[PDB]
Design a protein around this ligand. Structure first.
Ligand SMILES: *[C@@H]1O[C@H](CO)[C@@H](O[C@@H]2O[C@H](CO)[C@@H](O[C@@H]3O[C@H](CO)[C@@H](O)[C@H](O)[C@@H]3O)[C@H](O)[C@H]2NC(C)=O)[C@H](O)[C@H]1NC(C)=O
Ligand SMILES: *[C@@H]1O[C@H](CO)[C@@H](O[C@@H]2O[C@H](CO)[C@@H](O[C@@H]3O[C@H](CO)[C@@H](O)[C@H](O)[C@@H]3O)[C@H](O)[C@H]2NC(C)=O)[C@H](O)[C@H]1NC(C)=O
Ligand SMILES: *[C@@H]1O[C@H](CO)[C@@H](O[C@@H]2O[C@H](CO)[C@@H](O[C@@H]3O[C@H](CO)[C@@H](O)[C@H](O)[C@@H]3O)[C@H](O)[C@H]2NC(C)=O)[C@H](O)[C@H]1NC(C)=O
Ligand SMILES: *[C@@H]1O[C@H](CO)[C@@H](O[C@@H]2O[C@H](CO)[C@@H](O[C@@H]3O[C@H](CO)[C@@H](O)[C@H](O)[C@@H]3O)[C@H](O)[C@H]2NC(C)=O)[C@H](O)[C@H]1NC(C)=O
Ligand SMILES: *[C@@H]1O[C@H](CO)[C@@H](O[C@@H]2O[C@H](CO)[C@@H](O)[C@H](O)[C@H]2NC(C)=O)[C@H](O)[C@H]1NC(C)=O
Ligand SMILES: *[C@@H]1O[C@H](CO)[C@@H](O[C@@H]2O[C@H](CO)[C@@H](O)[C@H](O)[C@H]2NC(C)=O)[C@H](O)[C@H]1NC(C)=O
Ligand SMILES: CCCCCc1cc2c(CCCCN)cccc2nc1N
Ligand SMILES: CCCCCc1cc2c(CCCCN)cccc2nc1N
Ligand SMILES: *[C@@H]1O[C@H](CO)[C@@H](O)[C@H](O)[C@H]1NC(C)=O
Ligand SMILES: *[C@@H]1O[C@H](CO)[C@@H](O)[C@H](O)[C@H]1NC(C)=O
Ligand SMILES: *[C@@H]1O[C@H](CO)[C@@H](O)[C@H](O)[C@H]1NC(C)=O
Ligand SMILES: *[C@@H]1O[C@H](CO)[C@@H](O)[C@H](O)[C@H]1NC(C)=O
Ligand SMILES: *[C@@H]1O[C@H](CO)[C@@H](O)[C@H](O)[C@H]1NC(C)=O
Lengths: 749, 742
C-alpha cells in the first residue's frame, strides 16, 4: 500500500524530509532500514518515537525543528541495530545521554554542545566517525569547549574525529591510535607539541587550518594569534605520522615552513597552504625537496598586501615536485608572466593543472605553455589580460570552492585554456599564437565586442567546445567561427548587447558551415531580429537552446519572415523555447519545427492555448514541457495525436478539469506532471479505460482538491494502482471543505 | 457613495479600464463626463449601452474584447455632447454608421477597415482629428485601402488626419485646407505629384516616411520600391506649404535632396531624414543652405553598407544651420572623429545636442568639443571607444523619443555620455581638454579599475556620475574623492569583484563628500567589506542597497556589520529590498538612522517583524514591507509610532487584522493590505485613513462580512481601490464576485 507520510523504496529507505511533520510518524513501514526526517518540525524525541522501527540502521534528524530538539535520556537505546545517527542543526545543549552502543557514525554538527564527556561518548566503543564541528565559533554566544580527559581513548575503533570551529585551545590528549582523519580547523590552537600526535601512526589526514589565521579581508569574524604570529609547530610534531596523505595548514599565518616536518612523511599527496604569508618560501622553498610524491599543492592567497611585483618568483626547487599534477597559485598577485618565471615547472612529468586565477595579471607570454610536458588545464580566469540558515557549509572546504576549474563537458575534449573574466575586448590577428592544440577554450565575460570573421581562431583551429558567453559580440559577418571545422559545442549565451538593437546587423548564417556541431546555446540574447537570412540551418545540430529570446516578436501575426526559423535544423532532437514571452504560437510556425525532435520545451512562457492536434507531425517526440504557462484545456483525444510521448510536464498551469480517458489515453506516457494546477477533483470519467496504463509517475501536489466522498473514486483508483508513483502526498492537499482544509487527500475517511 | 464597477472623480472621470467587464455597465454615475472602458471584455455595443449618460464627452473603448467588437448603427448617436471617441484595436471591419455630428476626435487606429466612405465619414463635419492608421500593414491579411473620392472635403474643420500603415498608393485628392498635420507614413505612395498638396496652405506637419523604404536590416517585413528606388518627389510638390514646421522623409530611400524643395518653407523646425542613402548628400548638400530656422535635424542611419570610412564628411554648408539646436547623426558609421571633421558645426550658436550613437567610432579627439559655442549634451553611447502588436501606434517608428541623458543628470550642467563603449580603464589623460562636464555617464564599459582619487582630475566639477554596469575594483579608499562637488553616484551592477570573498572591497571614500546626496549600490551582491565595515556620510540623503546580501552581512554569528548604516547621519531614504532577509537582528534594526522618513524592506523573505522597534524612528512616514512572508500583525501599532502615514503590506501571509487597527491608527493615511490571506475583517478591527487596499484577499462572502460591508458604506472618505478585484473566495455561489455585490 501507498506509504505515508514518507516516500519509501528499496535500495529499504524512507524519505520523510522537509515535510512539515511535527512528531515522528508512527505510520512508517516496519521493514525500513534508513529514515530521513531532516528539515521537519519535530520537537521531542522519546523512547516511544521509534517504537516499531527496530529494523532501523540509519536515522537523520538534522534541522529539527525547521524555524530546539528536546531528546530524552535513552530515547534511542532500544534501537539495537542503529549505526548512523545524524543530529545536525538541532540546538542540542549536550550530547544526548544514553546513546546506543551499536553506533558507528554520529554527527552533532552545528549545535550548542560545549561539553564533551565520558557519560555521553565513552561507552560508544564502536564509533568509526564522530563529528562535533561548528558548535562554538565566530561571534556566536557560546563557551570554550571542555573536553573531559580521556573521553576519546575508549574509542579504539575511531577512524574520524572532527572538532573544527570550536574553541579548543589545545589538541586534546589521549586520542586513540586508530585515527585516520583528524580535523581541528579553527579551534584556536596556537601551539602543537611533540605529544599531540605521537601515536597516530595510521593518520592519513590532518587539518590544522585556521589556527593563528591570516585575518586581512576576512569573510568572517577573525581573531589572530597575538601580533598576527604564526601557528607554532614543534620540530617533532609529525614524527610518527608516516601515513599522512593530506595536510591542511591554510590560514595559520606561516612565513616559514620547516622542511623537517616532512622528514618521515613519504606518502604526502595534498598539501594545503592557502592564506598564509609564504611569498618568501615560494622563492626559496627548502621544504619542496621533501615532497616528491606530492600531487596537489595549493599556495593560493598568500599575496603581500599592497604589493604588485612585476613577476612571480618561483624557486628552482619546484623542479623536485616530481609527482605534482596540480599547482594552485591564486592570489599571489603580479603583473607579468614570463617564460623564464616558470622554468622550474617545465619538466614535471605529470603536472596537468596550473591555476593562476585572481592574480591581477596584465600580460602573459603564452608560448611558455608549449614548453611544458603536458598541461591539460590552463586556468587564467579572473585576471587583467587585455588584447595582445548559516553562511558556510559545514560539509565543504572553507577556504576554497571544490567544483572543477573547467566544466568537464569542455575538458573531456582535450587541452583547455580558460581566460574568462579578463578584459580581452577584442581578438587581434596574433592573440592565440604559439598556444598548444587547444580543444577547450573559455572566453566568457571578456566584454568582447568584435566581428568574428573566420580568422580569429586560426592559430588554434581544433577547438571542439567554445565558450563565448557573457560577451557583447557583433554578429556582422557570415564566416564567423568557420575556421573551427571540428567545433562540436558552442555557447553564445548572454550576448544580447547588439542583439537588442534593431538597427545593427545580426548574421547567424555561419551555423550552417559546421559538419560536427552538436550543441548550440543562444539563450538570453534577446533575439528578435536577424539580417538577410531569417533561418537557422544545420545538418549536424542535435540541440538548440533558445530560451530568453523574443520568439513573441519573431512569430508575431503580421510577420511571416521567421515562420520556418528552426526547420532547417534537420538533425534536431532537443529544443528549448522557454522564456520567449510566448502568448500564442502560430500553427504554421509550430508545424515548421523539426520533425526529428524528441524533446521540446516551451515552459515559462505565457501560453493560453496549445494546439494538441499538431503533434501528429512529431512521430519521435518523447518529452514535452509546457510548465509555467496559462493553459486552460486538455484535448480529450490525445492518443489520436501522438504515440511516442513518454513525458508530459504541465505544472503551473490553469487546468481545472481532465477529459475522460486522459490517464489511459497514454500510451507511452510514463511521467505526467499535473502539479500546481486548478484541479478540484478527478472524475471516474478520466479513470475509465479498456487498456493497461503504463504510467509510472503522476504528479498532483499543488491542486486545490475537493475533499468529499466526491473524490473517493480517484482514491480507490490510487489503491488499485500502486505501480503508479505519486510524490509528496503530504502536499497533495484539500483546499476544502473546512474540516479537511490542509490535510492530505489520502487521509480522509 | 461607492461607484461600481468604475472609479469616479472630478480630478468628472469614470475610470473603468481593465476590469474584465462583459458589457457596458448600467451602474455608472450619471454626471460622468469621460468614461474609460478600455481593456474590458465587451463584445457588443448598441443604442442602449449608454442610455442614461447623456452628459458624456469622451468614450474610450480601445482594445475590446480584450484577448470582434460588434457596434450597431447609431449605437452612439444619442450622445449629444460626445466629442472624443477612441475605438482602437477592436477588429472593426468597417467604420461604424450613425456616429454623432458632435464628434471632434475619432481614433480607429488598428482595426480591419479598408473602405473609407462618405457614409461613415462625411456627416462628421466637426471632426478636428481623425486617426485611421495601422489598419493594413506588413504581412497582415488585409486589402488595399479604398478611399472614396472627396470623402474628406466635407470635413472643413479637420486639423489632423492620419493614414499611416495602410496601403494607399496615392495621396488622397480633395483634402480640407483646414489641415495642419497629415501623416502618410508607410502608405506605399511611391510618387508625390505637384497637385497632391497644392490646396493645403495651412500645413505645419507632413509625414511621408517609409514610402520607398530602405529595407536592409529591416525590423519588419519591408517591400522596397522597384530596384530599391527612391520616392519620387516633384519639383513643386511643396510650393504652397509655407507654414511647414515638421517634415518626415525618413526611409524614403533618398540619394539626392532638391534644395528648392525648401525654398518656400523658411519656418521648417524639424526635419527627419533617417534611413536614407544620404552620405553623399551629407558631404555636399545644397539643401543645407535652405534651412535657416531649422532646430532639429535627424540624419541617422544613412550608413553605406559595408562601408567603414576613416572620417565623417560634413559639408561646410552646415554652417548655414544657424538655428540648429540638435543634430542627430547615429549610424553613419566611421572609424575616427577629428577636430577638423566638425569645423562647420563649431560656429552654430544654439547647437546644444550632438548625437553620435551607434557609429562604431574607435577614436575621438575630445579637444574638439571645447571649440563649440555651447554644447550641453555630448552623446557618444554605443561606440567602440577604448582607452497584440510589436510597434506602438502612438510612438515615432524610426527612433526612440526618450531623452538622451536622464534629465536628473542633464540638469546639473554640460553632460557627456560615453556609455556602452570599451573604456575598460581610465588612464591619466582620458579626460584632458574637456568642457567642464557636470554630468558623466560611463555605464557599461566593463571598467575594471581601482579608482584612486586622480582619474577625474581633469573634469573635477562632475555632480552626477553614472558608473553602473561595470566591474569596478574597489581597492582604494581615496576613490572618487577628487569630485568634491559630487551629488549623485550610481554604482549599481558592479558585482564582478564584490562577489569574490578573497578580493578587497573598500567603501570608505563615501564619507569624504560634503554634498553627496544620492548613492546607489544596488545589485552589487555586496556581502563582505575590508577593514571598515560601516558606511558613513554627514550629507547622504538617500541610499539604495537593493540586490545585496544583508542576509549574510547581518547573520547571527557575525557582529561586524551591526551598525552598517548608522553613520549615515542625514539619511531619510533607505532601500533594502532584495537582500534575501529571512530575519533582521534587533540590534541591527535599531542601528538604522533615526533621521529616516522612508524605509523599504520589500521583496525579501521576512517571516516576522519587531514592530516595537518603530518607537526609535520618530520621523518615519513610509514603511514598505511588500513581498515578504509575514504571518501576523501587531495589535499594538499606535504605541510604537505616531509618524507613519503609509504602510505597504501586499503579498504577505497575514490572515487576521487586529482589533483596534482601523479605529486607532493615528497618523496612518494609506494601508496596502492587498494580496494577503484575509478571509474576513472583524468589527473589532473597525481614522486619518483615506486609502485602504484589499484586492486579492480570499474573503468568505457570508454574512458578517456584513459588518465590514456596513463599515465601507459608512466611511466613503476611505477610498478602496479596485472594488472589482476585492473578490470572494467562498462560498461556491460567490466565487467570482466582488464582495460589494451582495
Ligand atoms: C583542509 O583540507 C582538507 C584536505 O584537503 C579538507 O578535507 C576535506 O574536507 C571536506 C569538507 O568536509 C570533506 O568533504 C566531505 O567528505 C565526505 C566523505 O566522502 C562527503 O560525504 C561530503 O559530501 C564532503 O565531500 C573531504 O572529504 C575532506 N577531504 C578528505 C581527503 O578527507 C578540509 O576540509 C580542509 N579544511 C577546511 C576548513 O577547509
Ligand atoms: C547552454 O546550453 C548548453 C546545452 O544545454 C548547456 O550545457 C548543458 O548543461 C546541462 C545542464 O543543464 C548538462 O546536463 C547535465 O550533465 C551532468 C553531467 O553528467 C548531469 O549529471 C546532469 O544531470 C545533467 O544531465 C549538459 O552536460 C550540458 N551540455 C554541455 C555540452 O555542456 C550550458 O550550460 C548552457 N550555458 C549557459 C551559460 O547557461
Ligand atoms: C515622422 O516625424 C513626425 C514629426 O516628428 C513624427 O511626428 C510625431 O508622431 C508622434 C507619434 O504619433 C506624435 O506623438 C504623439 O502625440 C500626441 C499628442 O500630444 C501624444 O498624446 C502621444 O502620446 C504621442 O506623443 C507627435 O505629436 C508627432 N509630432 C507632431 C509635431 O505632431 C512622426 O511620428 C514620424 N512618423 C513616423 C512613422 O515615425
Ligand atoms: C540608483 O538609484 C537612484 C536613486 O534612487 C535612481 O534614480 C532615481 O530613479 C527614480 C525612479 O525610480 C527617480 O524618481 C522618479 O523621478 C521622476 C522625475 O521627476 C518622477 O516622475 C518619478 O515618478 C520618480 O519619482 C529619481 O528621480 C532618480 N533619481 C536620481 C537622483 O536621478 C537610479 O535610477 C538608480 N539606478 C539604477 C541603474 O537603477
Ligand atoms: C567559463 O568561465 C565562466 C566564468 O568563470 C564559467 O562560469 C562559472 O561557471 C560555474 C559552473 O557553471 C558557475 O557556478 C559560476 O556561476 C560561473 N561564473 C560566472 C561569473 O558566471 C564557465 O563555467 C566557464 N566555462 C567552462 C566551459 O568551463
Ligand atoms: C547611462 O547610460 C545607460 C546606457 O545607455 C543608460 O541606460 C538606459 O536608460 C534607459 C532610461 O532609464 C533605460 O530604459 C535603458 O534600458 C537603459 N539601457 C541600459 C542598457 O541599461 C543610462 O540611463 C544612462 N545614464 C544617465 C545618467 O543618463
Ligand atoms: C588577490 C586579491 C588581492 C586584493 C587586493 C587587490 C590588489 C590589487 C593589485 C595588487 C596590489 C596593488 C596595490 N597598489 C593590483 C591591481 C588590482 C588589485 N586589486 C585588488 N582588489
Ligand atoms: C550602424 C549599424 C551598422 C551595422 C553593421 C555593422 C557595421 C560595422 C562596421 C562597418 C562595416 C564594415 C565592414 N568591414 C564596422 C565595425 C563593426 C560593425 N558592426 C556592425 N554591426
Ligand atoms: C567576412 O569576413 C571576411 C574576413 O574578413 C571578409 O573577407 C568578408 O568580406 C566578410 N564578409 C562580408 C560580407 O563582409
Ligand atoms: C546527426 O546526429 C548524430 C548524433 O549526434 C551525428 O552522429 C550525425 O553527424 C548527425 N547528422 C549529420 C548529417 O551530421
Ligand atoms: C490547429 O491547427 C490546424 C492547422 O494548422 C487548424 O486547422 C486547427 O484549427 C487548429 N486547432 C486548434 C484546436 O486550434
Ligand atoms: C590610493 O591611490 C593613490 C593614488 O593613486 C595612492 O597614492 C595611494 O597609496 C592609494 N592608497 C592605497 C592604500 O593603496
Ligand atoms: C542633509 O540633507 C539636507 C537635504 O539635502 C541638506 O540640505 C543638508 O546639507 C544635509 N546635511 C549635511 C551636513 O550635508
Amino acid at each position: 500500500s501507498r506509504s505515508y507520510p514518507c516516500d519509501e523504496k528499496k535500495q529499504v529507505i524512507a524519505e520523510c524530509s522537509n515535510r512539515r511533520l511535527q512528531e515522528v510518524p508512527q505510520t512508517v513501514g516496519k521493514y525500513v532500514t534508513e529514515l530521513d526526517l531532516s528539515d521537519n518540525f519535530i520537537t521531542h524525541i522519546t523512547n516511544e518515537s521509534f517504537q516499531g522501527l527496530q529494523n532501523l540502521t540509519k536515522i537523520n534528524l538534522n534541522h529539527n525543528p525547521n524555524v530546539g530538539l528536546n531528546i530524552t535520556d535513552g530515547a534511542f537505546l532500544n534501537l539495537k541495530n542503529l549505526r548512523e545517527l545524524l543530529l545536525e542543526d538541532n540546538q542540542l545543549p549536550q550530547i544526548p545521554s544514553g546513546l546506543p552502543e551499536s553506533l558507528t557514525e554520529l554527527s552533532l554538527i552545528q549545535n550548542n554542545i560545549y561539553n564533551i564527556t565520558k557519560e555521553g561518548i565513552s561507552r560508544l566503543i564502536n564509533l568509526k566517525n564522530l563529528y562535533l564541528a561548528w558548535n562554538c565559533y565566530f561571534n556566536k554566544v557560546c563557551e570554550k569547549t571542555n573536553i573531559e580527559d580521556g573521553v576519546f581513548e575508549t574509542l579504539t575503533n575511531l577512524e574520524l574525529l572532527s572538532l573544527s570551529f570550536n574553541s579548543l585551545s589545545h589538541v586534546p590528549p589521549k586520542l586513540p591510535s586508530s585515527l585516520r582523519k583528524l580535523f581541528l580547523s579553527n579551534t584556536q590552537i596556537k601551539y602543537i607539541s611533540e605529544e599531540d600526535f605521537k601515536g597516530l601512526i595510521n593518520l592519513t589526514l590532518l587539518d590544522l587550518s585556521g589556527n593563528c589565521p591570516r585575518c586581512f579581508n576576512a569573510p568572517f569574524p577573525c581573531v589572530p594569534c597575538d601580533g598576527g604570529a604564526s601557528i607554532n609547530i614543534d620540530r617533532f610534531a609529525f614524527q610518527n605520522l608516516t601515513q599522512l596523505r593530506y595536510l591542511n595548514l591554510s590560514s595559520t599565518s606561516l612565513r616559514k615552513i620547516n622542511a623537517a616536518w616532512f622528514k618521515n612523511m613519504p606518502h604526502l599527496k595534498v598539501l594545503d597552504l592557502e592564506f598564509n604569508y609564504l611569498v618568501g618560501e615560494i622563492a626559496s622553498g627548502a621544504f619542496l625537496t621533501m615532497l616528491p610524491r606530492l600531487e596537489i599543492l595549493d599556495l593560493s592567497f598568500n599575496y603581500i598586501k599592497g604589493s604588485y611585483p612585476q613577476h612571480i618568483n618561483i624557486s628552482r626547487n619546484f623542479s623536485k615536485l616530481l609527482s605534482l599534477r596540480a599547482l594552485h597559485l591564486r592570489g599571489y598577485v603580479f603583473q607579468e608572466l614570463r617564460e623564464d618565471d616558470f622554468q622550474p615547472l617545465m619538466q614535471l612529468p605529470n603536472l596537468s593543472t596550473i591555476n593562476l586565477g585572481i592574480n591581477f595579471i596584465k600580460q602573459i607570454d603564452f608560448k611558455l605553455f608549449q614548453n611544458f610536458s603536458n598541461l591539460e588545464i590552463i586556468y587564467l580566469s579572473e585576471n587583467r589580460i587585455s588584447p595582445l540558515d548559516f553562511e558556510f557549509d559545514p560539509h565543504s572546504n572553507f577556504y576554497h570552492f571544490t567544483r572543477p576549474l573547467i566544466k568537464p563537458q569542455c575538458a573531456a575534449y582535450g587541452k583547455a585554456l580558460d581566460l574568462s573574466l579578463n578584459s580581452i575586448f577584442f581578438i587581434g590577428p596574433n592573440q592565440f599564437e604559439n598556444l598548444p592544440d587547444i580543444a577547450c577554450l573559455n572566453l566568457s565575460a571578456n566584454s568582447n565586442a568584435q566581428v568574428l570573421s573566420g580568422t580569429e581562431f586560426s592559430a588554434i583551429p581544433h577547438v571542439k567546445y567554445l565558450d563565448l558567453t557573457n560577451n557583447r559580440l557583433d554578429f556582422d559577418n557570415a564566416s564567423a567561427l568557420t575556421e573551427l571545422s571540428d567545433l562540436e559545442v558552442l555557447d553564445l549565451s548572454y550576448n544580447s548587447h547588439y542583439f537588442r538593437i534593431a538597427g545593427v546587423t545580426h548574421h547567424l548564417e555561419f551555423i550552417q558551415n559546421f559538419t560536427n556541431l552538436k550543441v548550440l546555446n543562444l539563450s538570453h540574447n534577446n533575439i528578435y531580429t536577424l539580417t538577410d537570412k531569417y533561418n537557422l540551418e544545420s545538418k549536424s545540430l542535435v540541440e538548440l537552446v533558445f530560451s530568453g529570446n523574443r520568439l513573441d516578436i519573431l512569430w508575431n501575426d503580421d510577420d511571416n519572415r521567421y515562420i520556418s526559423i528552426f526547420k532547417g535544423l534537420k538533425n534536431l532532437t532537443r529544443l528549448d523555447l522557454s522564456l520567449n514571452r510566448l502568448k500564442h504560437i502560430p500553427n504554421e510556425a509550430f508545424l515548421n519545427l523539426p520533425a526529428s525532435l524528441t524533446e521540446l520545451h516551451i515552459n515559462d512562457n505565457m501560453l493560453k492555448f496549445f494546439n494538441w492536434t499538431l503533434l501528429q507531425q512529431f512521430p519521435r517526440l518523447e518529452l514535452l514541457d509546457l510548465r509555467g504557462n496559462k493553459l486552460l484545456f486538455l484535448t480529450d483525444s490525445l492518443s489520436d495525436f501522438t504515440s511516442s510521448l513518454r513525458t508530459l510536464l504541465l505544472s503551473h498551469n490553469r487546468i481545472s478539469h481532465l477529459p475522460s480517458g486522459f490517464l489511459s489515453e497514454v500510451s507511452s506516457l510514463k511521467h505526467l506532471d499535473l502539479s500546481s494546477n486548478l484541479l478540484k477533483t478527478i472524475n471516474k470519467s478520466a479513470l475509465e479505460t479498456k487498456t493497461t496504463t503504463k504510467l509510472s509517475m503522476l504528479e498532483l501536489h499543488g491542486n486545490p482538491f475537493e475533499c468529499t466522498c466526491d473524490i473517493g473514486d480517484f482514491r480507490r483508483w490510487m489503491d488499485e494502482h500502486l505501480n503508479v508513483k505519486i510524490p509528496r502526498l503530504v502536499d497533495v492537499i484539500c483546499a476544502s471543505p473546512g474540516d479537511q482544509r490542509g490535510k492530505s487527500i489520502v487521509s480522509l475517511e
